[PDB]
């Protein structure tokens, strides 16, 4: 059991643009979640070898983490704000698929998801 390569943070065969929404997702949404006290388990891909979680990448076939989302925003990987919001949703959903109710990681995901929703609420037009 080993780790997959992390998600792509670059697509050479994809146009790029700067929008108010993408800038807000990096500078306000991601930055706010990144600095939250419960951010640390979500700042990098799950390392199944280091943490000894051999069934993680048997159960989770669409991994996502805030380190990947950060790099995607910084590299102008996303064309649509929807793509970035979908990646956050995937990250939270994976946590609820793999882990059990009352697990520390699940209550941490709940706290971050609540904050995420409050910040996306004020996403500009």
What is the binding site for ligand NV2 (CB under 6 A)?
Answer: 41-42, 46, 51, 53, 95, 98-99, 104-105, 108
3-state secondary structure of 12: coil
Are residues 92 and 113 in contact, defined by beta-carbon separation less than 8 angstroms?
yes
Nearest of 100, 90, 103 to residue 45 by alpha carbon: 90
Nearest of 72, 102, 74 to residue 90 by alpha carbon: 72
Shortest separation between residue 60's beta carbon and ligand NV2, angstroms: 8
Shortest separation between residue 50's beta carbon and ligand NV2, angstroms: 7
User: Nearer to ligand NV2 by C-beta: 14 or 40?
Assistant: 40
Shortest separation between residue 38's beta carbon and ligand NV2, angstroms: 8
Q: What is the C-alpha to C-alpha distance for residues 89 and 74, in angstroms, rounded to an integer?
A: 19
User: Nearer to ligand NV2 by C-beta: 4 or 124?
Assistant: 4
Shortest separation between residue 67's beta carbon and ligand NV2, angstroms: 11
User: Nearer to ligand NV2 by C-beta: 111 or 123?
Assistant: 111
Q: What is the C-alpha to C-alpha distance for residues 93 and 3, in angstroms, rounded to an integer?
A: 19
Are residues 65 and 43 in contact, defined by beta-carbon separation less than 8 angstroms?
yes
User: Nearer to ligand NV2 by C-beta: 22 or 116?
Assistant: 116
């Amino acid at each position: 059991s080993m780790n997959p390569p992390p998600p792509e943070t670059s697509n050479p065969n994809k146009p790029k643009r700067q929008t108010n929404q993408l800038q807000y997702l990096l500078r306000v949404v991601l930055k706010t979640l990144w600095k939250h006290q419960f951010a640390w388990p979500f700042q990098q891909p799950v390392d199944a070898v280091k943490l000894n979680l051999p069934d993680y990448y048997k159960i989770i076939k669409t991994p996502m983490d805030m380190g990947t989302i950060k790099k995607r925003l910084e590299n102008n990987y996303y064309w649509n704000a929807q793509e970035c919001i979908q990646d956050f949703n995937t990250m939270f959903t994976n946590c609820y698929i793999y882990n059990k109710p009352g697990d520390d990681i699940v209550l941490m995901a709940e706290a971050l998801e609540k904050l995420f929703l409050q910040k996306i609420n004020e996403l500009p037009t």
